[PDB]
């Protein structure tokens, strides 16, 4: 296939300029203890962290109490038989409405998401998986990107527990893309750790409590593809299908060992995590704020020292900044535009014409090929400056 970029269909064009701190997409704030007003404003500069907007549901996450039945040991409810139902595909506004109506009638729900970042600059949430005790929902977050915010009614209802496994990034992705927030989170990863299970992954939990073997044969998959393949649909369904039962067992064990308070504490902090552009990231990197983390070569002269000659660091950096600006412009990831190995290859062979750039023994990307002359000029300039400097 080709998988047309789903962004070209967003009702609101992505902005990679980063000309101001992240602004919450939240227009309405249900289950509010503190009006949305006091929320959207700004926290002017400070030594530690520069100007930025605060987490809108930070207050309620701190003040609203947990449903009284989360503190009680209860008979656990086994996961529903996989074959007794099909996952419910939701990519319509009316289907989204009905699901919401269904989610409002629960005491707890299991949630997970599928993310894509190869063909997007910051990344995009491609799917949302939601399970109630009765059914599994698969939500098209590309097609309903603009509507999803209506889930805050349930996602921020402290009366409904939201169960996630290691939601540190989901929380980030949720606000950043759908303007969704979570109040009443229960993180099974933090629960696994508190109880002290040998391993703490979702896969480990599924294998031992749900006798379900998982396959990471999709952790490198393209969740943008419509329709979803059966095996991919099944794998997504498995992320939440068994989670509430695992929640029951972990929750009870926590109560039994008097460690629930800590898990709930950890979870509120995960839910409090705030997403901000690297441009406005706090000076001291903490687990309270998430800023994009280059999935590649050590900023500028990479430590992957392909024997990076001395004088050639300016060239290396210009290539980095060029790659980043193009990535932001076309809303692509730096690696799609030019992987480090190619950037390195360019720095190593320093081709100075189009032929040299495109025939790089290493192979070349579309961006590099379409900008071969610009890159050849950039490289010719870098060399000339060297032979000149000293």
Curated annotation (Swiss-Prot):
Q: Please provide, alphabetically and separated by semicolons, the GO molecular function terms listed in this UniProt record.
A: 3'-5'-RNA exonuclease activity; nucleotide binding; rRNA primary transcript binding; single-stranded RNA binding
What does the entry give for GO biological process? exonucleolytic trimming to generate mature 3'-end of 5.8S rRNA from tricistronic rRNA transcript (SSU-rRNA, 5.8S rRNA, LSU-rRNA); histone mRNA catabolic process; nuclear mRNA surveillance; nuclear polyadenylation-dependent antisense transcript catabolic process; nuclear polyadenylation-dependent CUT catabolic process; nuclear polyadenylation-dependent mRNA catabolic process; nuclear polyadenylation-dependent rRNA catabolic process; nuclear polyadenylation-dependent snoRNA catabolic process
- Record keyword Nuclease present: yes
Effect annotated for changing residue 331 to A: No significant effects on growth rates at different temperatures, processing 5' ETS RNA and poly(A)+ snoRNAs, non-significant or moderate defects in 5.8S rRNA processing resulting in accumulation of 5.8S + 30 nt RNA, increased accumulation of extended forms of snR40 snoRNA and U24 + 3 nt snoRNA
Loss of this gene results in the following: Deletion mutant is temperature-sensitive. Impaired growth at 37 degrees Celsius. Impaired growth at all temperatures, nonviable at 37 degrees Celsius. Mutant is defective in the 3' processing of the 5.8S rRNA and accumulates a discrete species, 5.8S + 30, that is 3' extended by 30 nucleotides. Accumulates 7S RNA. Accumulates 5' external transcribed spacer (ETS) RNA. Accumulates extended forms of snR40 small nucleolar RNA (snoRNA). Accumulates U24 + 3 snoRNA. Accumulates poly(A)+ snoRNAs.
Presence of the UniProt keyword rRNA-binding in the record: no
> Quaternary structure?
Component of the RNA exosome complex. Specifically part of the catalytically inactive RNA exosome core complex (Exo-9) which may associate with the catalytic subunits RRP6 and DIS3 in cytoplasmic- and nuclear-specific RNA exosome complex forms. Exo-9 is formed by a hexameric base ring of RNase PH domain-containing subunits and a cap ring consisting of CSL4, RRP4 and RRP40. RRP6 specifically is part of the nuclear form of the RNA exosome complex; the association appears to be mediated by Exo-9 and not by DIS3. Interacts with LRP1. Interacts with NPL3, NOP53 and PAP1.
Designated name of the protein: Exosome complex exonuclease RRP6
Q: Which organism is it from?
A: Saccharomyces cerevisiae (strain ATCC 204508 / S288c) (Baker's yeast)
Q: Which residues of the full protein are shown?
A: 129 to 516 of 733
């Amino acid at each position: 296939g080709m998988v047309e970029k789903p962004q070209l269909k967003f009702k609101s064009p992505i902005d990679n300029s980063e000309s101001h701190p992240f602004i919450p997409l939240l227009k309405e704030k249900p289950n509010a203890l503190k009006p949305l007003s006091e929320s959207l404003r700004l926290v002017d500069d400070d030594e530690n962290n520069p100007s930025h907007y605060p987490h809108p549901y930070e207050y309620e996450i701190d003040h609203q109490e947990y449903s009284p039945e989360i503190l009680q040991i209860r008979e656990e409810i086994p996961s529903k038989s996989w074959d007794d139902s099909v996952p419910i595909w939701v990519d319509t506004s009316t289907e989204l409405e009905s699901m919401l109506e269904d989610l409002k009638n629960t005491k707890e729900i299991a949630v997970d998401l599928e993310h894509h970042d190869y063909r997007s600059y910051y990344g995009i949430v491609c799917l949302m998986q939601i399970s109630t005790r009765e059914r599994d929902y698969l939500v098209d977050t590309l097609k309903l990107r603009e509507n999803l915010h209506i889930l805050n009614e349930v996602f921020t209802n402290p009366s409904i527990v939201k169960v996630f496994h290691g939601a540190f990034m989901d929380i980030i992705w949720l606000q950043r893309d759908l303007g969704l927030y979570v109040v009443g989170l229960f993180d099974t990863y933090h629960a696994s750790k508190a109880i002290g299970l040998p391993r703490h992954s979702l896969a480990y939990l599924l294998e031992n409590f749900a006798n379900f073997k998982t396959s990471k044969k999709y952790q490198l998959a393209d969740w943008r593809i419509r329709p979803l393949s059966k095996p991919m649909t099944a794998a997504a369904r498995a992320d939440t299908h068994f989670l509430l039962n695992i929640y029951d067992q972990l929750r009870n064990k926590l109560i039994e060992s008097n460690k629930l308070a800590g898990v709930l504490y950890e979870s509120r902090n995960v839910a409090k995590r705030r997403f901000e552009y690297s441009k406005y990231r706090p000076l001291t990197p903490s687990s309270e704020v998430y800023s994009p983390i280059e999935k590649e070569s050590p900023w500028k002269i990479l430590m992957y020292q392909y024997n990076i000659p001395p004088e050639r660091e300016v060239l290396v950096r210009e290539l980095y900044q060029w790659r980043d600006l193009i990535a932001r412009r076309d809303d692509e990831s730096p690696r799609f535009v030019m992987p480090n190995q190619l950037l390195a290859a360019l720095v190593a062979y320093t081709p100075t014409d189009v032929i040299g750039v495109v025939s790089l023994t290493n192979g070349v990307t579309e961006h590099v090929r379409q900008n071969a002359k610009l890159l050849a000029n950039l490289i010719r300039d870098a060399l000339r400056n060297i032979k000149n400097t000293n």
